[PDB]
Structures are given as structure tokens and as C-alpha cells.
Nucleic acid binder design. Sequence first.
RNA 1: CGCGAAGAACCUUACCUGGUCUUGACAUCCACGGAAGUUUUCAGAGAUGAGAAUGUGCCUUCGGGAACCGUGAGACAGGUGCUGCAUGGCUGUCGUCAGCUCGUGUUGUGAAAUGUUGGGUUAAGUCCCGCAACGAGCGCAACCCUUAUCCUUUGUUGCCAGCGGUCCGGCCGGGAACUCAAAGGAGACUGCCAGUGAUAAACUGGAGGAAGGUGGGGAUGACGUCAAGUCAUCAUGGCCCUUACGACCAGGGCUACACACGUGCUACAAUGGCGCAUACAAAGAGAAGCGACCUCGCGAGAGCAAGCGGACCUCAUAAAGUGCGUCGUAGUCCGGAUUGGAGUCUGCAACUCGACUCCAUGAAGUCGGAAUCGCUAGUAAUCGUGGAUCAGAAUGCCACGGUG
RNA 2: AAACGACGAAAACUACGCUUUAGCAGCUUAAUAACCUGCUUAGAGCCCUCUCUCCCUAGCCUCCGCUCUUAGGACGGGGAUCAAGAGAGGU
Lengths: 212, 100, 127, 83, 151, 99
Amino acid sequence: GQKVHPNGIRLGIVKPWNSTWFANTKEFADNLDSDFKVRQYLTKELAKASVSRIVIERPAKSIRVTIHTARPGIVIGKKGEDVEKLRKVVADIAGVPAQINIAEVRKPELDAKLVADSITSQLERRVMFRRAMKRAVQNAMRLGAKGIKVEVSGRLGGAEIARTEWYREGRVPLHTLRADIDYNTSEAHTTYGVIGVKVWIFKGEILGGMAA
Amino acid sequence: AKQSMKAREVKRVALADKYFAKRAELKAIISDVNASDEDRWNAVLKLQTLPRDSSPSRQRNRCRQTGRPHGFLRKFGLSRIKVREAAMRGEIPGLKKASW
Amino acid sequence: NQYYGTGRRKSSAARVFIKPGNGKIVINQRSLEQYFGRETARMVVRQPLELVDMVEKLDLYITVKGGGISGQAGAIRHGITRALMEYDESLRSELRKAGFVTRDARQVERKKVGLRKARRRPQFSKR
Amino acid sequence: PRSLKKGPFIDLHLLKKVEKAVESGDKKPLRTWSRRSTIFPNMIGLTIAVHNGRQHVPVFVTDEMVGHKLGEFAPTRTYRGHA
Amino acid sequence: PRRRVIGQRKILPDPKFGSELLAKFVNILMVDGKKSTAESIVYSALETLAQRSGKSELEAFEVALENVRPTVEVKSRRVGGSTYQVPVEVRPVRRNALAMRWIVEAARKRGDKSMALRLANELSDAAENKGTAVKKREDVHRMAEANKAFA
Amino acid sequence: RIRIRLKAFDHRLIDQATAEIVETAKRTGAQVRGPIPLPTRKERFTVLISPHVNKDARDQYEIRTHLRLVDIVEPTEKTVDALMRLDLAAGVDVQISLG
RNA sequence: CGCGAAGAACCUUACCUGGUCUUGACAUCCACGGAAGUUUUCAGAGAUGAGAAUGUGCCUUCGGGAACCGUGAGACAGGUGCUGCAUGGCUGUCGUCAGCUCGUGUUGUGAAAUGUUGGGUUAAGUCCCGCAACGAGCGCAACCCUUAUCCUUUGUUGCCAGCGGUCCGGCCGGGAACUCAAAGGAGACUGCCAGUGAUAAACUGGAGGAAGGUGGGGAUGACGUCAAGUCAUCAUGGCCCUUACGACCAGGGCUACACACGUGCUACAAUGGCGCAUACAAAGAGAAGCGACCUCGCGAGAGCAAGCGGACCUCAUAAAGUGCGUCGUAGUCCGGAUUGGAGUCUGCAACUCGACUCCAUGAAGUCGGAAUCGCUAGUAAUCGUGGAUCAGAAUGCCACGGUG
RNA sequence: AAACGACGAAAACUACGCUUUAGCAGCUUAAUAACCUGCUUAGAGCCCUCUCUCCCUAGCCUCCGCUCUUAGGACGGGGAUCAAGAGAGGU
Ligand SMILES: [Mg+2]
Ligand SMILES: [Mg+2]
Ligand SMILES: [Mg+2]
Ligand SMILES: [Mg+2]
């Protein structure tokens, strides 16, 4: 409750948005709800495949959903028809004609969500929490990142007291307005309660801002 | 986000979008002085025994996602607490913190 | 002829078109006296041509458009200076040696949230 | 207020009940539940028990109340002094 | 300010005749941003005073200010809640400023048909050391010089 | 006689969209008037970020709207078709006027 | 403590009063039947009971299907009920205060220390020097948003520098020097000369400069403190009610009261009120809309009503200012509240409970103890305008410029 | 009033894995080496999936929505199998 949310301050410098179509004060509540529904359905449909980001667009009364994942095999399916099969249901949800795109990420351990994922899975399957934390740190460090701050709140390792713990390797700035700060948060459900996982990742210095 | 209050609001739309023509013509007739007293009285008496909760200006504008009965904004159709988390995540095409 | 300037001050903006002859200052169509009420102002807009001596040897023609007597009164001066400079440029000295060459940036700050007038703060209830 | 040409707001049922009372010639009170209804001159000479939630308070309507609401004669709060 | 020690700011040269003293008098006499009517009042009063005294306007204003010019400021540098004030000499700039502030305050104190008339009447008294400015100067100086054992 | 009003939020993409129509016109025709940027509309909103009670936590956001005009006074047989057969990029909005 | 509540007449909103209910107002589910559905008739204030006039909307093998209703339970609902002493998320304060740590090395047997201390300097753990310290992270600044001089690009709904007609109006003929419009940049960096300081860092002057030492304003709130505040935005592990804490609508009350308090508007009257020429702003909102004219109304606004998702039209002759007159120090031609009545906007309905209006009574109050709070520059202080909430209902909130 | 510290030294998808090559980097006097690493590409070991090397046919298409129909090209329809090679990729 002290630090500012970094995405909301990095929106207008380097970090791209997740919804930037054109509405006029009438249908964006509806567009926002449709985006939320399609994202929450995509999460439940691809809870196994590691999925990090979902972006939306609305060119000329048509919805385009772009998914950035690391296991496109499950979503594509055999003979490349499951993607169209689920495009049918997302088009039914969105009403307007729909199309979907896949932006499979090579070496995606630098993605905030996919680096905060599978550690929730290890905690759920009762793997040691300290082992999971150190594995996540080493995996996020070995790919060339310059710093990952992940915050874990609530019953560390299925404990009985909601405590606060956080590791930090490298350097993770939060006040610099040029540093690419990929931020996300996830939750783990266990037999003893719920745990929160917040992740900041410092990609490095990026000058020139947008337009590559 | 009470479920009991989340149905009355949608009823107040699903019933107010049906009596649009009759109410509009009645308002025009009773607003134009070029009418008859008996006809206007009969029209207002017929209008008043129409279901009360079907009036247009009898429903408070309710938030879309959470239904907070205060701070409803026309621009986003969402309350302040939800528009904060929406603009902070970045789903609003153009919402950046500002500085004049 | 026409040596030109563009004075600015507060949210105002002038446009002086000096030329050679005799006072005949004329602002936004009206003449000086008619345009500017606060006789004070009717001196800021004659100060520059005083530090030289062209009060009666040059002409003029302005058209300020923004702000209020507050600073429109001044933008003229700045300009009458920038353009006076383009008459001879040897005057740059005296004119800077009098403050008539700088554009004052003094603007008007923003009501910040929680305060009530930029700086002033809601009175605090003692204890 | 309301537009001069729109008309008063006497109830469907209240009008029927007062018409029944006036051609039956009964002295029994007529109980009414409406509180935002106006007054008609034809009720002069009748006892109306108007309801405000606590009691059916009686009104012996005079010939000096037509152009206002009958509910002004029956408050809802209970207070006649702090002590 | 403990560390930031600033100088003294510059004011407009008062293009009516040209005098820093006159500019300061105008900008201390004005209130509620009414410098236009304040200038009209003070200039009418000074022009009347010029004929009333027989000298020039600026010279008559300067000598009238000097004749009621004070010398000591009675400040409150006490160590705590206990009452322990101290008189001290005044620098020339603050001296002139305080003298003209007392003049413009006596102008508001004494009432008449108009503020221009009040200013003229009070300047016509400060010319021969009368009115309110000289009385206030004497009343401050007596209590500033009667306390000499306290340093 | 024919004009297009471009409405967007990004000056780094609305310029590309303008280029993709002005070059198309200059290729399948001529006599263009270039991009004319109208005064952008900025709408400000103060939002309380206090969940229950804090009358000090305010955030001052603003929504931008950039408008540009691309008018081709003299059209050929191919200009209208070339500027209407475009695969317009998402996000931008086109108001075309053919009087 | 003008807090949520960015606007409680009913609806509303969770409180109160009467009445209807039971896998319920709202969620998936089977046995099937009726297209869903539109107008009215009635008893009840209403809650929802009877029902008629009716429609048979597109489709497989017609042991029919989607969609919507209806009943029968059981698989289910529902909780603004509580637990912020289970929590997530969020926020305020300490505090944009300047500190909070780590790696290696060194020192002491060791706990531990150095770095982080000491002089200058600053807004600063900011910079320098010395010193077993050397470096690094979160940190103080910058990178982010505007203003301040100048350059180029594009010139419409805008400008008329110059030229022309001209209904004297930029109307267009024209144009891109300018103000303005949005895109990319030059640009203030101790860069300089002098003094001081340790031949440093720095500070002070002055020169150029549009701006000078951070050029000027805003977001960005460092480890941590307050079982700090919200299970009433929301989600949420446990208790909980399951023929009622779930649920039904109508009428009240959240707006009341011998009181005390935070905050602000309104006034104390000669810089002040009464009226008649007359002036200069920025930024905004607009299709269930913004709503020019005109006919009217002492006034609110009534009728008719052009244009416009708008550099086009509306809201919107801004004032303070200014030149005149006038009043003359008086509960005042100050002060505008309470009162009876009148219509108007507005939403089915303003007795509880709106606002506007103008005729009429014209309160209090006449710079206010002890205390006490805000401001260091285009800021205090005054004047008006604009914006969101919403059928209307701002002295509250957020912004904007003028004076200064 | 309480607050211990033990075993990714019980690496929990292989992202096909499985092979191998140059440099980088953590390591330290400078280096190597294990791998501690990712990281450009090479080739095939080895399981692979798809279009194939089969033939028949000249299929073939596209502005006018229908048509013999016109420069033309990356244009291309049915039936069982694959001997060994070749493009891609890895549900
Ligand atoms: Mg739990
Ligand atoms: Mg020191
Ligand atoms: Mg300098
Ligand atoms: Mg409403």
C-alpha cells in the first residue's frame, strides 16, 4: 500500500497497453466487460499452458484477441483446429465477429506472470516454498535479466500467520521513468488458505521510448 | 453488489425501454397547451397507474462491474475504485496519469 | 520600413509594427487613450520610446490579443522593444539596461489537490 | 409543483370510495392510504382516516382545503419538546 | 529562512514622476489590487499638498517623511513565555518603509470626505510635525528609550 | 471536395496512418492538401483512490483525442477507391466526407 | 468530523411500519406443456391474484430442436450479518523527511565496527578532501508532464504583413511573416570571466542571455511505524441464518433537537452598496444532447424553434477595471436572512423535502476574549467563469484566468 | 509472554528431450576445467507429424455476381501403398 503501481506510470513511456481501440463514452463499459470475460475464459481454458499477456483490439466492429503464451501446442491442438474451435466460442461471447492471434514467446521466463507461475503450482503440490523461491530466482536470473523483485504475502509455505517476505537479486529500480518494469501479480490456493504473489522485473535501460 | 438490488435495476431498464412511445406522446400532449382538459386528465390518470418502478427518472445509475451506487461516471460507466484499477492496468485506450 | 516584434507577458501577446514618422500609436484599432483605461498602463506602453527619444519621431500599430489589462498592457512593451531593437540594435544596451527586454515568465500556478488556491491550505482544526 | 394544465392527482380507488360515500350518505370514516394525493371539493362533509404508518388519523375536511395535499394535516414525527 | 538569506527585490520606477520612494508609497498604500485608485488618490493628495506647502511635490513628501521618520524598532526576542522585548536601531530602508506605512495607516485612521482629503490633511500636519505619525513615533520612542538597562 | 477526419490517441501511429493515405493519393492521383492537425481534445478527471474514507488520495488523469484533416480537393477516378480499399490499422477512426 | 456521500422527495440506501412467499428477487439442473409475446377487464394503496381479446417467430426422421415462459421437489439460492485481532487488494500519517541495507576487504579471540564517521557545501548519504576502505541496491537528481527565447513542417473552421474590390464587414481574391493549431528540435551545462574557499567541491557577485545556478510549477512517497481505516467497491479460509438475518413493493425517516464543535459562504460599510456608457481570459461539455433566433413574461421560463460528435453552433455582452452621476456616516438606499402568498424549471408526486423568480416584513451583525490557522511571488488577498454527480438539488469538490 | 532456523545437500515441464561446435560470463595472479550459465549457428545420431518423390487427369482461376470464355501466375481435382531421398516444423 506504499509503492505506486508501476504499470500505471509506465503506460505512457515504454510499456504497451492491453486495450487501445476507439470508443466514445457509450460502449467502453461493454467493451471492458467483454475483454474481462474473454480473458477470464482464456485463463480457465489455458490454465495448463503458460499464458502471460492478452491484448485486445476493435478494428471496424470486429474484435481481435492476441495471446502471448509459451505452450501453443495445447491451444492449437491436433490438425490445427482447436484454435478455430475456441475462436467460435470467443466470437459467441463477444457478439461481434472475432479473430485470435498467437505470439508464442521464446525463452519466456522473463515474463512476469509465467515466472510467477508454476511456483504457485509447486506450493499447491506442497513442494518446499524456499526451494520454489530460489528456483524462480535462479531461472529469472539465468536468462539475462537485470533484477526481479517478487513479493510473497500470506502463510509462507502453508503457514498459519500471514507474513510478508520478498527476495531481490540484481537491481530493480522503481523511480526511474526509463526502466522497463514488467509487473504482475498472481494467487496460490492451498489447503490452509490463499497466498499472494507480486512480481516486478527490470528489463534494462530503454531509450527512445516507443517506436522501438 | 447486492444480488437483490442487481435485478431491480435491470427491471427498471427492461420496463422503461418499452413504454417510450406512449410516455413520449403523453408528455408532448400534456405539455402542448393546445389540448383538452378532460383528455389531459384521463391521460395523466392512465399514466399514473402504470407500474411505478418503470419510470425513466426513477432508477439510480448503477456501476457496471461492481454496482457501487455512488460515484458512477458517464465516461466509463464504472465507479472510482474500479476505474482506478482499470486505468492502472492499462485497459483504457489513453488513460495516463497526468500533469498540467 | 515596418520593423516588427512579438511581445508576450502573462497570457497575452502583442504585435508591434513600428515604422518612421510621428507618434500615431494605435492599438487594436482604438487609439491608446481609448484602448487603455488605467492611465498607468498608458505609460508602460510608452516607456521604451522614452528611453530612446522616438516618443515623437516614429509611428506604431499594435494588436494585442490575450489576457487582460493585467498583462496585455505589458506585452506591448516587450514587443515595442523587440522591434525597436530591429530599428538599430545599438539600442539593445539601454533597453536591456532597463528590464524592457526580458519576457517575464511569471505565470499562474495550478490548484493542487487538497489545497484550495495553490498553496493556501484548509484551516487545521486545533487538536 | 405541477403544470397548471396537467391536473390533480386523486386516486382511481379514492374517487370511487368518495363517490360511494356521497351517494350512500354514510357517516362512517373512509380510510385512505395515499399520502401524496390532492383534495377534491366533493369530499366536503366527510371524515377521512388517512394512514401514515402509525394510526389512521382522522380529518374532518372543511370547505377550506381544496387546492393543497390532504397529507399536510397529518405529520409523521412524534415530538412536542426536548424535555 | 535559516540558510537561504535573500537580498531586497526591485520595484517599478513609478513612471508618474520617477521615484522609488513614491513607488513604495503607492504599493504599500494600495490594497485589494486597487493600485489605480490608490495612485489617483495619492497623486491628488500630493498635488494639493504641493500648493498647500509652496514647495515641490517630491521635496515636500520627502521632508514630511523625514520629519516623522522614526529610529527604533521594538521587537520581541524574549527567551520564552516571559515578556522580554528589545528596542534596536532601524536600517534606513526599513525606516523609510515604516514611516510611510505609519503615514498611510494614519490616512485610514483619520476619516474625511475622501481618502485623498484624509491623506492631504494628514500630510499637511506631518509637514509641521502634527497628526498621528509624529504622535506614534513619540509614543514608540518613549518606551524604546525608557528601557535602557535591558540589553 | 472529399476529406477524411482521422481521430486517434497516438501521434506515432496517427502520423503513419496519415502517411499511408497521403502517399496513396499522391501515387494514384495528385493535388493533396497534407495533414492538418486540429486542436487536440484533452478531458481531465480527478479520481479518489480511497476505498472507504480518505479525502486526500486523489489521482488526476487525462484522456487525449488527436484530430487530423486530410482533404483531397480534386479527385481522380482512382483516388476514392484507393483511399477506401485500405486495410486500416486498428485504434484509429476515420470520418470520410465526399461532398 | 463540507469524510466515503461526484448532489437522501418515492425509487432510493443498508433504518422503521403494515401486509405476500419458500430450491425464493436473482444463479446451472431433469419430466414435459405452451413461440416468445401485445392491448386492455376487474379486487386490493401496494405486494399479485383471477383471467380474456390474441400470436402460432425460424428449423432434423414428426420416441423435435435453439430462444423465452409454467409447474414438482431435490441437486441449489441469498445475506450492505459479523469477524480489517485470518486476509488479499487499496489508502492516510511519520515523510519527497533523508536515510535504510548489501558484496568484498580490513580491524577486534569474540559479540561487533569500518564503510554510513569528521571540515567545507547543498534540498539531499548532493559534491570534494581526509580517513581500510573499496564498490553496489532501495535511495537524491535526471530520464516523465506543462511554462519560459528561437527553428522547421503542415494553413482550416483561424491571421489579415503587403496588394484589390468592398455592402466597412477579412466577405473573398490571395498568402503562409506572424498570434493560434499539433509533430519533430536548437536550447541553461557552472558554460564564462573575478573574489572567497583547501592551487578543491562550492558560495558570492557581472557578462552574455528569453531565462542563472534546480530557470519555473506537477506526478514519481526509500526499508520500515501506527493489531492505523475499510470483510459497506470487491474477493475472501473458517461461524451464521435454509418456510428467514433470504426475498416483495407502498408510506415515512436518513433532512429532527433545550445543545457544544471542525470548515466555509455571507456582511461590519466612503477602497463601501444604488443605478447608466465601457473594456480585456484560459480551458472546457454537448445527439434520451448541446440547444442560435423570434413572439412574450417586472422576473423564473412558456410557445414556435436554425445550426452542430463541433478551431464552425450553444452554454457565454464575465467582473473586478474604467469614465460619469448619486448617497454622507446613519441598524445605514449597509447587511438578505425569517415570514404570508404568487407562479416557473424539473422529474408519475416538492406539507416532511428541491431550486429559480419577483411584489411585500426587512432578523441578526456594526472587525468579535483566551486562544488559533494559512501563506516567502505572479504566491497571499479579491473578482468572475469553467468542469464532474444527476430528472433538477453546491457556500461542498476539482480546475481556469484577471488584478496583484 | 512468546519468534526458530535441518536434506533443489529428496531441482517437480524438458520448452521435445537426446548429441556435439565458437565465443561470453560467475569463478581467480592470469587462466582453464567441471557446469554455472544463457547465447549465434552447424550437421546428423535418434524416435518423429505434415506437404511430398505414386499414378490418373490437365486439372486449373476470376472481373458480373452464372457462363465456352481472356494477358497470366506463386493457379491447381480423385484413388491403395510408400522403397530411398527432400521442404517445413514439433499436439
Ligand atoms: Mg487462508
Ligand atoms: Mg559532513
Ligand atoms: Mg548569470
Ligand atoms: Mg437522478
